[PDB]
Design a protein around this nucleic acid. Structure first.
Ligand SMILES: O=[N+]([O-])c1cc(C#CC[C@@H](O)CO)cn1[C@H]1C[C@H](O)[C@@H](COP(=O)(O)OP(=O)(O)OP(=O)(O)O)O1
Ligand SMILES: [Mg+2]
Ligand SMILES: [Mg+2]
Length: 540
DNA sequence: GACCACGGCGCC
DNA sequence: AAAGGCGCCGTGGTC
């Protein structure tokens, strides 16, 4: 039992803290404590006590650092046993689970959290002795990345609130036009947001053909993929699909985001969760700014609401065909390496083939559709689904996924090699040695085993791309600070920066070069960069 | 007011 | 719906 000692703690103590709510930019700091050398220090008043700390070292360090930044204090995050645990096994995503697994209990009291941070760090650091590549990821990627994310979180992004308020009222009237039409076509009103009520209308009352079933409960599905297949069978289907687009966008983005502007900053603040995915990707939450719309016209209007501070510009940088370049390097395939030493475009080539269109005329919306295909195909799509996704006979679907792989021969050999390894060692790994455990590779149920296989051989690709982006963020951040620029958002293979208008061009050039040269591969990494007043206009 | 499962769907 | 990775919505049901 730790000796209760007076605040403040010595240098290097492990911190524990309790927030009123999970979001650091919104939380009240209820209690603060620290632990070292067999002592626990409980702060009499936690906000004032923040100033005594040189570094947030402990569980969820980045969250406390964001809160410190909100208060104008430079309290960078350091060691965090969650990052160690996450690198050992990315299923380690919560403090509850990590505590249970590596020697304690996550409670609701700062002193115990500080003591727990200290014990867990000792034990996890032991487990990582001799895992030289994981230790490198920790010291060279994750631990410094957490500083970057804290600054992104605390900086936020500006949003055109008035513009969105106006858009809500317009979309509201159109939703009423669509719903009124649906209720007439059904002969009666019902809750069009209830997929159970819609299922009855569509397949019992109107006797439309039920195509597919839902996964867990076996209901007749009303998914867009099912509705797409029925849009000719009935005019109500078309209106329902339009109703779904508008209500999805209004309820998820248009209406909520303007209520989340922070009173102190006047900006919108997401969270970049650093121990949340099986592959090493970041995730974004509260709100998720990694799934802001972009595909449809209305979606594009929402994206335009993300704007630069007055007298600044946004700079948007996006890696080209990133996971395909990573695949070329991991596999060694020559026909593929060649494709990227020759600056060819496959999302354009596919978009030309599936549209019967010269590459000159593949517009931005055709190229996305081709990304569904190329990635859908590569990570294990079925001929049958493929035949449906791009509307061609099944026999055609088989051909695309046969030429898609014989054109690039040594991919399949890399797949087989990755699965064999994952079976023997129990995990697969990225170029840098990030691991994902995939136990079901020897499941005796084919469907389970084969799903495990698609998860296992995807991870080195998606996770290497994630390692590269994280490393680029870590390299780029100090260069932006020196140029008075900011890092705002990451969206997996994309960064959005904010720069003074007078240095925006120099920032964009520098950023592009840092990202392309992050870690040279057997193919070049290319980055598309754009500058604009709003997120959309900054992607050309 | 809280929680969860589910279907559904937004992005990468 | 049908052979990768996420988080948030409304419904429905529950406590
Ligand atoms: O299954 N996936 O793995 C996947 C699907 C999608 C998608 C999509 C299109 C629509 O959802 C919206 O239109 C993306 N991924 C992965 C692979 C890609 O490499 C990386 C970065 O995604 P993205 O930048 O969009 O593609 P990519 O870098 O290749 O090409 P660009 O040159 O920048 O256009 O995420
Ligand atoms: Mg890209
Ligand atoms: Mg992208």
């Amino acid at each position: 039992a730790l000796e209760e000692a007076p605040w403040p703690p010595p240098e290097g103590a492990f911190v524990g803290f309790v927030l009123s709510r999970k979001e650091p930019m919104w939380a009240d700091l209820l209690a603060l404590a620290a632990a070292r050398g067999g002592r626990v220090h409980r702060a009499p008043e936690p906000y004032k006590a923040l100033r005594d700390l040189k570094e947030a070292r402990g569980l969820l360090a980045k969250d406390l650092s964001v809160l410190a930044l909100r208060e104008g204090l430079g309290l960078p995050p350091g060691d965090d046993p969650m990052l160690l645990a996450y690198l050992l096994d990315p299923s380690n995503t919560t403090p509850e689970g990590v505590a249970r697994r590596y020697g304690g209990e996550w409670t609701e009291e700062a002193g115990e959290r500080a003591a727990l941070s200290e014990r867990l760090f000792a034990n996890l650091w032991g487990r990582l002795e001799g895992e030289e590549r994981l230790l490198w990821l920790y010291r060279e990627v994750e631990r410094p990345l957490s500083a970057v994310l804290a600054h992104m979180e605390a900086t936020g992004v500006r949003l055109d609130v008035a513009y969105l308020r106006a858009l809500s009222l317009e979309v509201a009237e159109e939703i009423a036009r669509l719903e009124a039409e649906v209720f007439r076509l059904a002969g009666h009103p019902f809750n069009l947001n209830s997929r159970d009520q819609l299922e009855r209308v569509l397949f019992d009352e109107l006797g439309l053909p039920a195509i597919g079933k839902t996964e867990k409960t076996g209901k007749r599905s009303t998914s867009a993929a099912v509705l797409e297949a029925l849009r000719e069978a009935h005019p109500i289907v078309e209106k329902i699909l339009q109703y779904r687009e508008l209500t999805k966008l209004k309820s998820t983005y248009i209406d909520p985001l303007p209520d989340l502007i922070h009173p102190r900053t006047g900006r919108l603040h997401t969270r970049f969760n650093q121990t949340a995915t099986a592959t090493g990707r970041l995730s974004s939450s509260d709100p998720n700014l990694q799934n802001i719309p972009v595909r449809t016209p209305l979606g594009q209007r929402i994206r335009r609401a993300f704007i630069a501070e007055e007298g600044w510009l946004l700079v948007a940088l996006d890696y080209s065909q990133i996971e395909l370049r990573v695949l070329a390097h991991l596999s060694g395939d020559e026909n593929l390496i060649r494709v990227f030493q020759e600056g060819r475009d496959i999302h354009t080539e596919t978009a030309s083939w599936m549209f019967g269109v010269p590459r000159e005329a593949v517009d931005p919306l055709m190229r996305r559709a081709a990304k569904t295909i190329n990635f859908g195909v590569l990570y294990g799509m079925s001929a049958h689904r493929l035949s449906q996704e791009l509307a061609i006979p099944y026999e055609e679907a088989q051909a695309f996924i046969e030429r898609y792989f014989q054109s690039f021969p040594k991919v399949r050999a890399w797949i087989e090699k990755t699965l064999e390894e994952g079976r023997r060692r129990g995990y697969v790994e990225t170029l840098f040695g990030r691991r994902r455990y995939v136990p079901d590779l020897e499941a005796r149920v084919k469907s389970v085993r084969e799903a495990a296989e698609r998860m296992a051989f995807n991870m080195p690709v998606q996770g290497t791309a994630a390692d590269l982006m994280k490393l680029a963020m870590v390299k780029l951040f100090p260069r932006l600070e020196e140029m008075g620029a900011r890092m705002l958002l990451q969206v997996h293979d994309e960064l959005v920066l904010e720069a003074p208008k007078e240095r925006a061009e120099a920032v964009a050039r520098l950023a592009k070069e840092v990202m392309e040269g992050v870690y040279p591969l057997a193919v070049p990494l290319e980055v598309e960069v754009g500058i604009g007043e709003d997120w959309l206009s900054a992607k050309e």
